[PDB]
Symmetry: C3
Subunit: 276 residues, 3 copies
């Protein structure tokens, strides 16, 4: 039911089973799917497409103007949201810009928590947790099952690979390989092993986790340069397909791969001081 | 007066002298006490109990669903708020969960500032300042008179003892003894002496402050392990009751006590290089 | 047009061409100028003065009570905002206090982004970017063209000089000279050269940039104390007027000047180990 105290543009298409609470404002050419609830005080920008079974909390702003100095009124701007999402209080999801395709997209089954910001042209996958205060600048890709903890910041054009975990207040300025744990290097971020807890919970087998950890070693513990490491990883991925996401993220990197700048202190050459 | 433009469920109990501003949304079985003002755009969740003389600012969300993967609709969730509180813009206070008692509680005379988040099952005491952007994950206990500065984050199940001061952007991952100053170790937090400024202002005497500082030494400067330090503190507390809160926080710790990991650099054994 | 679903006090003066969206709340003795839009859900506090061509987004709170323990009802509190500003979602701009003049002021052509907090008695100049989550405690001065990146915090009474750039999550606790790049020293902030990118974009010439960089050297690379450096800078400013803002910020400092505490590691005396 559309509450009598909501404002809805007449061109909006709202499924019968959708709940539009009091004091919601729904813009031009919006589509809202079946069984989606907008609790109260929700603003939906022009052209937004929202799927089924979504729960959107008060003071969430969805599909409104990008914050981009290159944007000007007359540009087409859109947010697409999938199904089964929870979007909490004061979240902001902005539409895309003309320099790409004008689309910000969010997939399925995500938990987007309080004060979370998803900037213009982001691509958010499925089954993701964005904890309170996460901020994603424009053009950020977050892959399936990733966890970004509270106050995590991700700079423009960065990618977080599948099943990664980013710890409280880490700043992500380079691409994060899948499966990784990333801690705050106070200002910045560093690799901190594999997300073994998430992986066990999601049904990864000992054999799969062994291969993922070996890739971690190849990347960060064997004294190899990125060219040499990537070549080894590609060969590994042939036999073990659970490693394919490594090939994706590293191969298509825009901003370079997250490194451990202090690996030389703990790599093979540092720790091998005996024969055998 | 209940503004004509507010939405109030008919089962809500609102004192005559309460002010419910325009565009407020008040849920089922809510109780709002005498002389409490809800300025405008305030959302109050089902079952919430709010005391007297409270001032709640626009876009504050109080008593709504917990963010907890263990929560499911059908669970009883409640926020209890005491008297004389100020709750500022965009604050979020979530109800409790079924794994405890389903109650988040806030005491008296608190200042909860802009964008502050009080997660499920928190217990907030009285006379506390939570500065802009403070985030408290579930099950956090904040004791009386504590100051948590801007952007302070506290992880789940942690406790901040009475009269503590937590500096800008510190992350609290262990229990904080009463009376302490805590600074940001950039990512994390460390002890930085006693909150002498707050303590003087609150009427603590030279004798009391001398004993509190001696406990600081026992904990962090005498080269003692926690078992040995706690035993000394317990004996001290018999003679001087101002130390009792030390016994409370340390004795009942869930997450361990905040340490100085670099105490060995500045302890008795490091600084004693002469006789006498 | 004033939307039928907005609440406007009868003493408010609103220009014909102003757009007051649905669910806005406009307080006593407010003035809103020509061609300013308040999108929806905007709260404007008593006595606020807003200029022309402003665009203010949903859930922005402007001109309401200061967060100051010295403030009491009956004190005059005001926000003044200039022209051509963009103020994004969930921004909070608080009025001034009685200990100064009771005025918070914002100039022209600013971009104030999501969740930005401008505390009591701030003075914000023109052409400034305050990126998401910036927090300015009371009495903060931000000079023209400054960029404060996401989650930057500025303590009370601090000044950021013209054309400065403050990097992600830096904490500003001292005055920042004009033209500087400032990075997060994880907890705190440090000088990191000159804002050469902003300066080139704003039409600064090679000669001007050469002089600005020489002042950087005088301040941070020649092993000089602040008294000696300031005296040299003052003489430099006579010949080259682009340096005058250095004289302003350093000469009138309330909180001291931002230093590089580790300059002795990289100064003239450290790097000069040969003749010639």
């Amino acid at each position: 039911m559309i509450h009598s105290l909501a404002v809805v543009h007449e061109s909006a298409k709202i499924a019968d089973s959708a709940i539009i609470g009091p004091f919601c404002v729904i813009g031009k050419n919006v589509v809202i799917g079946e069984n989606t609830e907008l609790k109260s005080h929700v603003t939906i920008g022009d052209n937004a497409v929202i799927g089924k079974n979504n729960r959107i909390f008060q003071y969430a702003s969805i599909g409104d103007d990008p914050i981009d100095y290159t944007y000007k009124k007359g540009d087409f701007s859109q947010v697409v949201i999938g199904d089964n999402n929870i979007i909490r209080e004061c979240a902001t999801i902005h539409g895309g810009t003309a320099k790409e395709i004008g689309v910000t997209s969010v997939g399925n089954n995500n938990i987007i928590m309080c004060y979370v910001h998803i900037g213009h042209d982001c691509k958010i996958g499925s089954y993701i947790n964005l904890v309170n205060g996460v901020g994603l600048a424009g053009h950020v890709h977050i892959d399936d099952y990733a966890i970004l903890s509270s106050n995590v910041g991700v700079h423009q054009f960065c990618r977080v690979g599948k099943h990664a975990f980013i710890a409280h207040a880490a700043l992500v300025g380079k691409d994060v390989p899948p499966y990784l744990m990333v801690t705050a290097v106070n200002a910045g971020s560093t690799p901190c092993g594999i997300n073994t807890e998430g992986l066990k919970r999601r049904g990864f087998t000992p054999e799969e986790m062994k291969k993922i950890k070996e890739v971690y070693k190849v990347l960060y513990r064997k004294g190899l340069m990125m060219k040499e490491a990537f070549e080894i990883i590609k060969e590994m991925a042939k036999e073990d397909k659970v490693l394919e996401p490594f090939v994706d993220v590293i191969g298509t990197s825009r901003r370079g791969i997250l490194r451990d700048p202090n690996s030389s202190s703990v790599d093979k050459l540092a720790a091998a001081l005996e024969h055998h």
